[PDB]
Amino acid sequence: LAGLDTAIILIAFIITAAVLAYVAVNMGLFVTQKAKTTINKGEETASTA
Amino acid sequence: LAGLDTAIILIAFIITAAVLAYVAVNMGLFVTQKAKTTINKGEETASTA
Amino acid sequence: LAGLDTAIILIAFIITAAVLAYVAVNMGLFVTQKAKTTINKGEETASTA
Amino acid sequence: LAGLDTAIILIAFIITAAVLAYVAVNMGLFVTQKAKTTINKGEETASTA
Amino acid sequence: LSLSGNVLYAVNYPTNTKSYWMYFTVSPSSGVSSVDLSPSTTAISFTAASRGVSLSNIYQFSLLSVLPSQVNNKVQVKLGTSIINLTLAFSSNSAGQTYVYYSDPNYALLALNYTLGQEVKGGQLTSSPLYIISNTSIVASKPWLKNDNVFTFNISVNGTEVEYYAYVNKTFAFTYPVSGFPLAGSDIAPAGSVIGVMILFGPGEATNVFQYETVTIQITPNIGSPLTISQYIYQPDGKVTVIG
Amino acid sequence: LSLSGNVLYAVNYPTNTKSYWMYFTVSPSSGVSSVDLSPSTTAISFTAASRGVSLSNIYQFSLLSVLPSQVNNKVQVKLGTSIINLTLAFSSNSAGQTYVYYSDPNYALLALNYTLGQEVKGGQLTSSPLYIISNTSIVASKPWLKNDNVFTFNISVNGTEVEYYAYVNKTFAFTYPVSGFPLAGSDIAPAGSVIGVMILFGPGEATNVFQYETVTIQITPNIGSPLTISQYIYQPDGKVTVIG
Amino acid sequence: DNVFTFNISVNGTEVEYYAYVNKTFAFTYPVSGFPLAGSDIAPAGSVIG
Ligand SMILES: *[C@@H]1O[C@H](CO)[C@@H](O[C@@H]2O[C@H](CO[C@H]3O[C@H](CO)[C@@H](O)[C@H](O)[C@@H]3O)[C@@H](O)[C@H](O)[C@H]2NC(C)=O)[C@H](O)[C@H]1NC(C)=O
Ligand SMILES: *[C@@H]1O[C@H](CO)[C@@H](O[C@@H]2O[C@H](CO[C@H]3O[C@H](CO)[C@@H](O)[C@H](O)[C@@H]3O)[C@@H](O)[C@H](O)[C@H]2NC(C)=O)[C@H](O)[C@H]1NC(C)=O
Ligand SMILES: *[C@@H]1O[C@H](CO)[C@@H](O[C@@H]2O[C@H](CO[C@H]3O[C@H](CO)[C@@H](O)[C@H](O)[C@@H]3O)[C@@H](O)[C@H](O)[C@H]2NC(C)=O)[C@H](O)[C@H]1NC(C)=O
Ligand SMILES: *[C@@H]1O[C@H](CO)[C@@H](O[C@@H]2O[C@H](CO[C@H]3O[C@H](CO)[C@@H](O)[C@H](O)[C@@H]3O)[C@@H](O)[C@H](O)[C@H]2NC(C)=O)[C@H](O)[C@H]1NC(C)=O
Ligand SMILES: *[C@@H]1O[C@H](CO)[C@@H](O[C@@H]2O[C@H](CO[C@H]3O[C@H](CO)[C@@H](O)[C@H](O)[C@@H]3O)[C@@H](O)[C@H](O)[C@H]2NC(C)=O)[C@H](O)[C@H]1NC(C)=O
Ligand SMILES: *[C@@H]1O[C@H](CO)[C@@H](O[C@@H]2O[C@H](CO[C@H]3O[C@H](CO)[C@@H](O)[C@H](O)[C@@H]3O)[C@@H](O)[C@H](O)[C@H]2NC(C)=O)[C@H](O)[C@H]1NC(C)=O
Ligand SMILES: *[C@@H]1O[C@H](CO)[C@@H](O[C@@H]2O[C@H](CO[C@H]3O[C@H](CO)[C@@H](O)[C@H](O)[C@@H]3O)[C@@H](O)[C@H](O)[C@H]2NC(C)=O)[C@H](O)[C@H]1NC(C)=O
Ligand SMILES: *[C@@H]1O[C@H](CO)[C@@H](O[C@@H]2O[C@H](CO[C@H]3O[C@H](CO)[C@@H](O)[C@H](O)[C@@H]3O)[C@@H](O)[C@H](O)[C@H]2NC(C)=O)[C@H](O)[C@H]1NC(C)=O
Ligand SMILES: *[C@@H]1O[C@H](CO)[C@@H](O[C@@H]2O[C@H](CO[C@H]3O[C@H](CO)[C@@H](O)[C@H](O)[C@@H]3O)[C@@H](O)[C@H](O)[C@H]2NC(C)=O)[C@H](O)[C@H]1NC(C)=O
Ligand SMILES: *[C@@H]1O[C@H](CO)[C@@H](O[C@@H]2O[C@H](CO[C@H]3O[C@H](CO)[C@@H](O)[C@H](O)[C@@H]3O)[C@@H](O)[C@H](O)[C@H]2NC(C)=O)[C@H](O)[C@H]1NC(C)=O
Ligand SMILES: *[C@@H]1O[C@H](CO)[C@@H](O[C@@H]2O[C@H](CO[C@H]3O[C@H](CO)[C@@H](O)[C@H](O)[C@@H]3O)[C@@H](O)[C@H](O)[C@H]2NC(C)=O)[C@H](O)[C@H]1NC(C)=O
Ligand SMILES: *[C@@H]1O[C@H](CO)[C@@H](O[C@@H]2O[C@H](CO[C@H]3O[C@H](CO)[C@@H](O)[C@H](O)[C@@H]3O)[C@@H](O)[C@H](O)[C@H]2NC(C)=O)[C@H](O)[C@H]1NC(C)=O
Ligand SMILES: *[C@@H]1O[C@H](CO)[C@@H](O[C@@H]2O[C@H](CO[C@H]3O[C@H](CO)[C@@H](O)[C@H](O)[C@@H]3O)[C@@H](O)[C@H](O)[C@H]2NC(C)=O)[C@H](O)[C@H]1NC(C)=O
């Protein structure tokens, strides 16, 4: 038993960490692309006149 | 008997661990989405001016 | 007789294990909800400013 | 008898816990090496340009 | 379940007096196991706590139950003399399985209008809460459609824009397959499937737009942890707005 | 997946009344592991929230499934008397593996036109949403091509410019290999491969150009985090424009 | 006790008010983005004086 129930908490905590991994990677891909776009618009703002 | 009563403590401890699994996964899904939203609002706060 | 008295110890030990099952499940439901509440208050403490 | 049958549940539960031990140690060795490899590839991705 | 897309919110923009629908995408978490999404077993709750709105279960229908042959070529557009059969459930093959999905919420809505009208016609359902028409002239003959919530969407047929008017009797949710779903007929989302969830607001919850408010949605299947979704909603910024 | 190139957007420049395609390049992030890109399992969503356009899955086809022998020497140009076989999938060898790629979106489009026409001919697909012709005279005999979305591209054959007209039935996306792809036949992008993603607009989404608007694309494979791509689009400045 | 003055305009006429302050104290009031009148809660995107 000590492991069976302990195996239930391992499965669940893996899934819980994998959900943070999923969100953090997606949102890093998002924000870094917002940064890419912003850097481009910043250069365009400095060059165009 | 040694197993019959021992089988009562296994059933109960499984349910107890499954209840933590249920709560931890739900609350991880919740907090990671609060993080997603926060990351978005942080970028919006840095970009909007 | 060997079984009659042996049947008295089985009934009693079942009840004894069922009492632990009752307590452990109740107290797991309690503590996991204290965890849920705490996780919420932790996020609120990190977000509110 | 109370011990003979009780000795059957001890042998079995030891084996059951040893099986979790076997799996958890193997899979920890696996995932920590996936982490090692990932950390290396992350540095290589930051350095190579 | 994990939230596996943005949460989209639709309103009568720019006027923002009335609320139309929310759309979001879900999938089984970390690819580990399948989830039963049958609307008999599963609940979807919706709460906007600030305004005291709390619906314990809005989930009514699923297109996961529906085979492509039940919806394709069964709604049609009269463009003058010509009559065009619509294809709504798209499909593709891998490893001898047919995958089924709806490319957008508009084809999902039309497939649902058909399915629910067909279930009313078959006596399996008392009334459809959704009614979709291209012809608005009909509404004068059907006065119950005057007061319930209405929104519009366009599809293209023979390269021509067709506007449909969707009439919604009460706030309800439905689900439909988006990718990785070979189990057509089942209501089960397998691991590595992607499921669209759409909430259409009725005249109660539609009454004014969500602003400066927290909206919580929770999907609770019969096995496993529920998925709880929460957004604080700022003023909506377009016909559709990304809220989360 | 990481976005591993610029996002290119094509329109009927300078008139800017109509929208043709978007192209961008993706690769598995930081070289760590492979990604399944099969169009049965994966979704690509497209949303232009301002105008209420929201497509939950537009991904239909992949040339990652396609061996060079299935496309090379299988489309041809009649330059007067002479007939020239095209090579579309380029290939090279390293360590006993054959790498496969398409040098540009034009050869990828022709390889897809062939592949989908061949799948229709084989009864595996009901209709191709893409049809590509050099001869425009044909269009009068095929009135369904009159109203769907059309764009043109040129390739050079025997040093002569050949214009092709691409007719697009509905908004769809496809993927094709660009480099580091030895796994031809598989739909799997291995770590250190580069995959072209191309979205062709149908007559619905084509109807007017994106300006002063946010466009979001999301690629969601069956395992791992989705890649979410977002651009605010200013007025497009050429036949192709770099939007992100 | 401490006294300061401020002017408001009423019927285009300057009215001087004298404010008498017994002890050092602070108060808050809404400046923008505050629909929650009655609550003492500053919502996200409100501005409080
Ligand atoms: C496009 O949609 C139509 C309406 O749902 C559908 O008509 C129905 O057809 C079924 C049986 O199909 C046969 O007959 C139809 C003509 O009615 C033919 O188009 C088809 O090839 C078959 O021969 C019939 O039971 C039902 O009453 C019809 N409904 C209506 C309102 O007419 C069409 O079949 C369908 N497909 C095509 C190719 O037009
Ligand atoms: C959504 O379901 C409605 C039923 O709940 C259905 O209304 C019925 O419509 C049929 C006739 O349908 C054909 O004609 C219409 C135009 O009149 C086409 O748009 C449609 O594609 C079909 O070819 C009618 O006999 C019946 O009386 C109606 N029933 C009710 C309750 O009003 C709607 O047609 C359907 N929406 C769509 C877009 O199909
Ligand atoms: C919402 O509930 C209404 C009252 O319960 C109901 O109104 C009744 O409609 C029936 C039949 O007309 C409609 O049937 C389908 C539903 O199966 C509608 O989608 C469509 O618009 C048909 O016109 C009518 O005989 C009856 O007199 C009405 N009664 C009352 C009290 O209003 C609506 O049908 C139902 N759904 C919608 C979409 O409004
Ligand atoms: C939508 O419903 C209308 C009434 O419910 C119906 O109009 C009725 O139809 C005829 C007249 O023919 C119409 O046909 C064409 C094409 O549908 C229309 O564009 C045109 O303007 C005509 O009105 C007539 O018997 C009846 O009195 C009409 N009723 C009304 C109130 O106009 C429409 O035909 C139908 N479809 C469309 C596309 O509007
Ligand atoms: C969705 O379809 C509508 C009808 O199928 C179409 O409206 C028709 O178009 C013109 C009027 O111009 C419209 O154009 C803008 C932008 O599309 C609309 O926002 C505006 O409100 C105008 O209505 C007209 O010839 C025709 O009578 C219209 N028909 C109806 C029923 O309104 C819409 O243009 C089309 N797109 C959108 C975004 O709504
Ligand atoms: C260039 O493209 C042609 C069209 O796809 C292709 O013709 C096809 O050929 C296959 C079998 O190939 C043999 O026969 C062809 C002539 O048809 C020879 O060129 C080739 O050397 C082989 O001997 C045939 O099954 C199919 O019907 C043909 N299709 C058509 C439309 O004619 C050519 O093979 C290909 N290569 C060359 C070198 O011309
Ligand atoms: C590419 O176009 C060239 C003309 O722009 C053409 O050169 C001329 O060819 C003709 C006919 O002779 C060739 O026929 C075949 C082509 O399929 C060749 O394999 C063969 O060797 C012949 O040379 C010739 O009368 C004329 O002199 C050529 N023009 C010049 C300036 O030299 C090419 O043949 C053609 N190539 C292909 C592969 O189609
Ligand atoms: C894209 O796929 C189309 C099929 O979906 C295909 O149309 C078919 O064309 C064949 C004949 O193909 C040969 O001839 C044309 C010029 O007529 C060449 O451009 C081409 O390279 C081939 O050598 C015809 O038998 C059939 O009826 C057509 N099918 C349909 C549905 O129209 C297109 O040819 C193809 N595009 C290209 C550039 O190959
Ligand atoms: C987009 O969808 C149209 C309707 O579903 C369809 O029109 C039908 O086309 C068929 C066959 O003609 C075409 O076949 C291929 C598709 O496999 C086309 O790429 C090519 O242009 C061929 O000419 C025709 O028999 C039928 O009458 C048409 N029916 C209708 C209602 O339009 C288109 O084929 C399809 N694809 C494209 C590229 O437009
Ligand atoms: C594109 O399709 C046309 C018709 O679908 C076809 O024209 C038909 O072909 C012949 C006449 O010969 C033509 O051949 C050359 C080379 O293709 C042309 O440049 C020239 O102008 C001739 O027209 C005839 O039987 C038929 O009536 C023609 N039909 C029409 C409408 O013109 C073209 O040959 C074909 N290819 C090209 C390159 O245009
Ligand atoms: C889509 O709308 C087109 C008009 O915008 C229409 O083309 C015109 O069609 C008419 C009538 O001819 C067609 O009738 C059926 C359509 O059901 C076709 O299968 C058939 O091949 C005929 O061509 C024609 O007078 C006119 O010349 C066409 N216009 C042009 C510019 O070519 C299409 O027929 C229609 N398609 C469908 C499938 O409804
Ligand atoms: C792409 O190929 C076209 C045909 O294969 C070719 O058009 C032919 O060229 C001339 C006309 O000059 C064109 O030149 C400019 C710049 O290329 C074009 O933008 C302009 O619109 C003219 O059309 C003519 O002899 C021939 O008839 C044309 N053929 C057709 C079908 O238009 C284009 O020049 C070539 N390049 C581009 C950038 O479009
Ligand atoms: C605020 O309101 C005061 C009374 O409501 C007013 O004072 C009255 O104005 C004049 C005297 O001139 C004043 O003007 C300057 C600039 O405003 C002051 O700084 C200066 O100290 C003078 O007092 C007089 O007719 C009347 O009796 C004054 N009343 C009182 C009670 O002083 C202030 O002028 C006005 N503005 C400011 C900035 O204090």
Numbering used by the authors:
A (entry chain K), B (entry chain H), C (entry chain E), D (entry chain G): 12 to 60
E (entry chain A), F (entry chain D): 61 to 304
G (entry chain E): 208 to 256
Question: What does the report in the manuscript say about this coordinate set?
Answer:
A deletion mutant MW039 (Δagl3), lacking the sulfoquinovose synthase Agl3 generates a trisaccharide N-glycan, missing the sulfoquinovose, one mannose and one glucose molecule. To investigate this, we cultivated the Δagl3 mutant. Moreover, we found that archaella extending from Δagl3 cells still supercoil. Next, we purified archaella and Aap from this mutant and solved their structures by cryoEM. In the maps of the mutant archaellum and Aap, the glycans were clearly altered. The densities for the sulfoqiunovose, the terminal glucose and one mannose were missing. However, comparing the protein structures of the archaella and Aap with and without glycan truncation revealed no significant differences. These findings demonstrate that the motility-reducing effect of the glycan truncation is not due to structural changes in the archaella or Aap. Interestingly however, only the O4-linked α-mannose was missing from the N-glycan trees of the Δagl3 filaments, while the O6-linked α-mannose was still present. However, S. acidocaldarius Δagl3 mutants were virtually non-motile, indicating that glycosylation is important for archaellum driven motility in S. acidocaldarius.
